[PDB]
Design an enzyme around this catalytic site. Structure first.
Site, PDB file in Angstrom:
ATOM      1  N   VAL A  48     -62.026  -6.419  24.241  1.00 61.08           N
ATOM      2  CA  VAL A  48     -62.304  -7.647  24.196  1.00 61.08           C
ATOM      3  C   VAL A  48     -63.739  -8.418  24.750  1.00 61.08           C
ATOM      4  CG1 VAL A  48     -62.160  -9.216  26.478  1.00 61.08           C
ATOM      5  CG2 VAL A  48     -59.939  -7.034  25.439  1.00 61.08           C
ATOM      6  N   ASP A 151     -47.863  -2.960  32.867  1.00 59.08           N
ATOM      7  CA  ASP A 151     -48.372  -2.507  33.386  1.00 59.08           C
ATOM      8  C   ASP A 151     -49.481  -3.506  34.172  1.00 59.08           C
ATOM      9  OD1 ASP A 151     -50.802  -0.783  32.490  1.00 59.08           O
ATOM     10  OD2 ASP A 151     -51.986  -2.253  31.243  1.00 59.08           O
TER      11      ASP A 151
HETATM   12  N1  ANP Z   1     -58.955 -13.473  30.711  1.00 57.03           N
HETATM   13  C1  ANP Z   1     -60.111 -12.821  31.053  1.00 57.03           C
HETATM   14  N2  ANP Z   1     -61.522 -13.178  31.356  1.00 57.03           N
HETATM   15  C2  ANP Z   1     -62.075 -12.118  31.854  1.00 57.03           C
HETATM   16  N3  ANP Z   1     -61.909 -11.027  32.082  1.00 57.03           N
HETATM   17  C3  ANP Z   1     -61.148 -10.558  30.713  1.00 57.03           C
HETATM   18  C4  ANP Z   1     -59.684 -11.357  30.111  1.00 57.03           C
HETATM   19  N4  ANP Z   1     -59.135 -11.295  29.432  1.00 57.03           N
HETATM   20  C5  ANP Z   1     -59.662  -9.552  29.735  1.00 57.03           C
HETATM   21  N5  ANP Z   1     -60.298  -9.425  30.294  1.00 57.03           N
HETATM   22  C6  ANP Z   1     -61.576  -8.534  30.749  1.00 57.03           C
HETATM   23  O1  ANP Z   1     -61.107  -7.251  29.203  1.00 57.03           O
HETATM   24  C7  ANP Z   1     -60.963  -6.289  30.148  1.00 57.03           C
HETATM   25  C8  ANP Z   1     -59.769  -5.435  28.922  1.00 57.03           C
HETATM   26  O2  ANP Z   1     -58.715  -6.739  28.559  1.00 57.03           O
HETATM   27  P1  ANP Z   1     -57.149  -6.194  27.978  1.00 57.03           P
HETATM   28  O3  ANP Z   1     -56.305  -7.346  28.033  1.00 57.03           O
HETATM   29  O4  ANP Z   1     -56.430  -5.461  29.130  1.00 57.03           O
HETATM   30  O5  ANP Z   1     -56.936  -4.774  26.963  1.00 57.03           O
HETATM   31  P2  ANP Z   1     -56.481  -3.741  26.774  1.00 57.03           P
HETATM   32  O6  ANP Z   1     -56.851  -3.380  25.532  1.00 57.03           O
HETATM   33  O7  ANP Z   1     -55.180  -4.551  26.735  1.00 57.03           O
HETATM   34  N6  ANP Z   1     -56.457  -2.382  27.940  1.00 57.03           N
HETATM   35  P3  ANP Z   1     -55.581  -1.891  28.745  1.00 57.03           P
HETATM   36  O8  ANP Z   1     -55.660  -1.957  30.468  1.00 57.03           O
HETATM   37  O9  ANP Z   1     -56.534  -0.297  28.840  1.00 57.03           O
HETATM   38  O10 ANP Z   1     -54.326  -2.092  28.191  1.00 57.03           O
HETATM   39  C9  ANP Z   1     -60.501  -6.573  31.360  1.00 57.03           C
HETATM   40  O11 ANP Z   1     -59.849  -5.385  32.607  1.00 57.03           O
HETATM   41  C10 ANP Z   1     -61.865  -7.410  31.569  1.00 57.03           C
HETATM   42  O12 ANP Z   1     -62.149  -6.825  33.018  1.00 57.03           O
HETATM   43 MG    MG Z   2     -52.918  -3.157  27.457  1.00 57.21          MG
END
Ligand code: ANP
Ligand code: MG
Length: 330
Positions: A48, A151
């Site tokens: 991200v 989740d």
């Molecule tokens: N809209 C947003 N604004 C600010 N920070 C963000 C935002 N979207 C994501 N993040 C950051 O990015 C991190 C990971 O985002 P995420 O969309 O959950 O990816 P992921 O690969 O699915 N991680 P996971 O929780 O292990 O499944 C978050 O924990 C935030 O700190």
């Molecule tokens: Mg996810």
């Protein structure tokens, strides 16, 4: 073997044009109108970045997915486009990809977040009632549109405390709820998994998200992160058993014809129910009331058909300060 209490009808009553994400055709945006600035997060299947939509010169988030399981990608997009304009749901700005590798990205709104272990201890009693209530709003909305997040956890709840605003992010595990479907139990994070996940019951529904909501809340009000601290997925069930009790677990497994796995014979003893009040301390007493404990106690139930619906939970007395406050603002 189990239908949802609420909203079981929804995907049937909306069309196949609402839930059939395999046949969604993605109208990609222009990869080159975005410039990635700085890494803000990581994930199992993602990265991200804080980024700029160049033509507008504006802050946004770019999340680069793992390109395989192509339909898992269309699922997350179809859910984000479906939940468009929903209260407290992260806003979808664009879907782009790389011309050569075909690796896709989702572009979402930026939220100025404070990481929760920094932010949660700074909350007042009202903050907690207020941010949970705002989050209940997102959960109720998507449940009423036939979607399960699967989740829920602090890491996917962006809070801009200065703006007093909340966004639920990360719909990479969101699936559509179809009555009687056997869903994958390898969803959610360990500390927020339902008992139905931990015992391999596959016919779960929107109530799974409520067990997780209760795991968040429990750690917020007792200041115990995480509240259930299992070392593996089997230890997760034992750490929950030490609180809720082994009696009420056995009555629930019988109620559902679940036959526990043999690994649990040696690790799962007889445990009495520890009342919620034994989690009250001086350091965490600021958050404690009987409204709160009662409310937590109706989230955190073995039988998922005993948990509050997100709609029901907004009606709870706990949230009455928030309801009346927003009404006097009106
Ligand atoms: N809209 C947003 N604004 C600010 N920070 C963000 C935002 N979207 C994501 N993040 C950051 O990015 C991190 C990971 O985002 P995420 O969309 O959950 O990816 P992921 O690969 O699915 N991680 P996971 O929780 O292990 O499944 C978050 O924990 C935030 O700190
Ligand atoms: Mg996810």
């Amino acid at each position: 073997r189990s239908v949802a209490r609420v909203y079981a009808n929804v995907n049937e009553k909306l069309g196949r044009s609402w839930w059939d994400y395999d046949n969604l055709v993605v109208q990609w945006g222009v990869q080159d109108n975005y410039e990635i600035v700085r890494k803000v997060g990581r994930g199992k299947y993602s990265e991200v970045f804080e980024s700029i939509h160049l033509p507008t010169d504006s802050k946004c988030i770019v999340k680069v997915l793992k390109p395989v399981k192509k339909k898992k990608i269309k699922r997350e997009i179809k859910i984000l486009q479906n939940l468009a304009g929903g209260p407290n749901v992260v806003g979808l700005l664009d879907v782009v990809r790389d011309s050569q590798s075909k690796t896709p990205s989702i572009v979402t709104e930026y939220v100025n977040n404070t990481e929760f272990k920094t932010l949660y201890p700074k909350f007042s009693d009202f903050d907690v009632r207020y941010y949970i209530f705002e989050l209940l709003k997102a959960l109720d909305f998507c449940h009423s549109k036939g979607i399960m997040h699967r989740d829920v956890k602090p890491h996917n709840v962006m809070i801009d405390h200065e703006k007093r605003t909340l966004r639920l992010i990360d719909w990479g595990l969101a699936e559509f709820y179809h009555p009687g479907t056997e869903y994958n139990v390898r969803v959610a994070s360990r500390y927020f998994k339902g008992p139905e996940l931990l015992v391999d019951f596959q016919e779960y529904d929107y109530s799974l998200d409520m067990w997780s909501l209760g795991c968040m809340f429990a750690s917020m009000i007792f200041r115990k992160e995480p509240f259930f601290h299992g070392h593996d997925n089997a230890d997760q069930l034992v750490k929950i058993a030490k609180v809720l009790g082994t009696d009420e677990l056995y009555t629930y497994l019988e109620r559902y014809d679940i036959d526990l796995d043999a690994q649990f014979d040696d690790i799962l003893g007889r445990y009495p129910r520890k009342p919620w009040s034994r989690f009250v301390s001086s350091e965490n007493q600021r958050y404690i009331s009987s409204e709160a404990i009662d409310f937590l106690d109706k989230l955190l139930r073995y039988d998922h058909q005993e948990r509050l619906t997100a709609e029901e939970a907004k009606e709870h007395p706990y949230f009455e300060p928030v309801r009346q406050a927003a009404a006097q603002a009106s």
